[PDB]
Design a protein that fits this description.
The structure holds two protein chains of two kinds.
Chain A (H helix, E strand, L loop, with lengths): L7 H11 L12
Chain B lengths: L1 H7 L4 H6 L3
Classes of the chains: A mainly alpha, B mainly alpha.
Protein name (chain B): Insulin A chain
Organism (chain B): Homo sapiens
Chain lengths: 30, 21
């Protein structure tokens, strides 16, 4: 994978990519 | 939390896969 600071939906999109159908959890606003 | 390691800093697939089911 590339090493870049992800933010906004970019970061999510990655999980949506890595996790694909596995299902991931993105929330708990830091 | 993943927001900090990946936004404030670059994350590693191990961290990304870690938040995945």
């Amino acid at each position: 994978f590339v090493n870049q600071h992800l933010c906004g939906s970019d970061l999510v999109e990655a999980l949506y990519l890595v996790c694909g159908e596995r299902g991931y959890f993105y929330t708990k606003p830091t | 939390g993943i927001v900090e390691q990946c936004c404030t800093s670059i994350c590693s697939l191990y961290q990304l896969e870690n938040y995945c089911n």
